[PDB]
């Protein structure tokens, strides 16, 4: 079930500490990565997304990516389609290594040190 | 509680044609062009809704304006100041006929000559939008319309290329979606090309290719699961005619139809 869209229902080495990285699973950006070092990131379509994620489904304004108390979390800022991590729609999540990231068709593994 | 009787000056409504998911569609008279038009409004009941007014707000920013005969053209977009609030609208080329979820489902699976027909001018609009860089990603029976003339009417083409959010297409049934929709994989044309080739099968058997009690199970097929040949599911109809129907239902779009203007030549080779 893992294997199709979420519509259909200790850690990483070589990262700076306190960082972690998102990285395309599948798709024609697969490969494509971002790492998250900052308090707030944002991700979307909008050209100025500090994720930027160009795809039909995804709203300009999907998400963030915010760093409190020593860890990353995932939040909805109003996207159309949603967040969903781990197949699961979410408002806000707190992320984990290994964690899948659905936003629009983007199917992104969130990685974090140990 | 009631629905407007004019939207803007120039178009008044008449009776409801049918309904959507949150829309209902009105046969109306286009006052300005001396006209009949097909209106898409979002559900009278509905209207007061902040969340279903801004879904239908996009889909009215996003419904492209394609012109040719075999799409359902459309001619204007709009939001009507109504007294319950604003109304988004989109004006549509009336279709006098029935979608070919509605011939499945009452008269039974077409005659071979008929469904090859209907798919074939299905082809040549998915072939002009196409050219027109616009992927329709939605390909299903409930898309295609038959006038009263016997007319080909594909619908519900997106505008493709601030651009406007679209909805995700794999919410549904999942009996139409293509592998690479189901796993999130790169969609190009050849996506159309499948779904077509599951409407095709479906007018030609009288059920679609795959079928399950979830649509995990459904996309699961569509992904492993090799379709059986349309003769061994329905009685007179062609081996020539079966290798059409699985060439476009092939797992990998490399051996499918690359154009629907390929998909359209091997059916008129069939029809003769
Ligand atoms: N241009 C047109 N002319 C005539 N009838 C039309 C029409 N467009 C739509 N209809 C009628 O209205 C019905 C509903 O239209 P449609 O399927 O496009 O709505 P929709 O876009 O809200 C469905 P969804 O919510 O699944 O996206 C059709 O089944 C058909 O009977
Ligand atoms: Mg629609």
């Known amino acids: 079930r893992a294997d199709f869209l979420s519509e259909l229902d200790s850690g990483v080495e070589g990262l700076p500490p306190g960082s972690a990285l998102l990285v395309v699973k599948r798709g024609p950006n697969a490969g494509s990565r971002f790492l998250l070092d900052q308090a707030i990131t944002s991700a979307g379509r909008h050209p100025d997304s500090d994720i930027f994620l160009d795809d039909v489904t995804v709203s300009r304004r999907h998400a963030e990516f915010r760093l409190e108390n020593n860890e990353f979390n995932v939040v909805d800022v109003g996207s159309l389609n949603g967040t969903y991590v781990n197949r699961e729609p979410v408002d806000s999540a707190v992320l984990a290594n290994g964690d899948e990231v659905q936003i629009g068709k983007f199917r992104l593994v969130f990685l974090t040190g140990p | ?272």
């Open chain 2, 1 to 272: 509680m009631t629905t407007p009787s004019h939207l803007s000056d120039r178009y008044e409504l008449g009776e409801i044609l049918g309904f959507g998911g949150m829309s209902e569609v009105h046969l109306a008279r286009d006052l300005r062009e001396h006209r009949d038009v097909a209106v898409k409004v979002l559900r009278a009941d509905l209207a007061r809704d902040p969340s279903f007014y801004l879904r239908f707000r996009r889909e009215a920013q996003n419904a492209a304006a394609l012109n040719h005969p075999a799409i359902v053209a459309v001619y204007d977009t709009g939001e009507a100041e109504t007294p319950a609030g604003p109304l988004p609208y989109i004006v549509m080329e009336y279709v006098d006929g029935v979608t070919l979820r509605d011939i499945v489902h009452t008269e039974g699976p077409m005659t071979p000559k008929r469904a090859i027909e209907v798919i074939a001018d299905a082809c040549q609009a998915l072939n002009f939008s196409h050219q027109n860089g616009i992927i329709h990603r939605d390909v299903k029976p409930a898309n295609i319309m038959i006038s009263a003339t016997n007319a080909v009417k594909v619908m519900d083409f997106g505008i493709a290329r601030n651009s406007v959010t679209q909805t995700a297409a794999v919410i549904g049934t999942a009996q139409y979606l293509s592998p690479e929709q189901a796993r999130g994989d790169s969609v190009d044309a050849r996506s159309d090309v499948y779904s077509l080739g599951c409407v095709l099968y479906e007018v030609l058997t009288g059920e679609p290719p795959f079928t399950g009690d979830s649509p995990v199970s459904v996309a699961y097929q569509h992904v492993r699961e090799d379709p059986i040949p349309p003769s061994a599911r329905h009685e007179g109809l062609s081996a020539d005619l079966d290798a059409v129907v699985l060439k476009a239902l092939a797992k990998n779009p490399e051996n499918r139809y690359q154009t629907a203007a390929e998909m359209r030549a091997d059916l008129v080779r069939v029809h003769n």
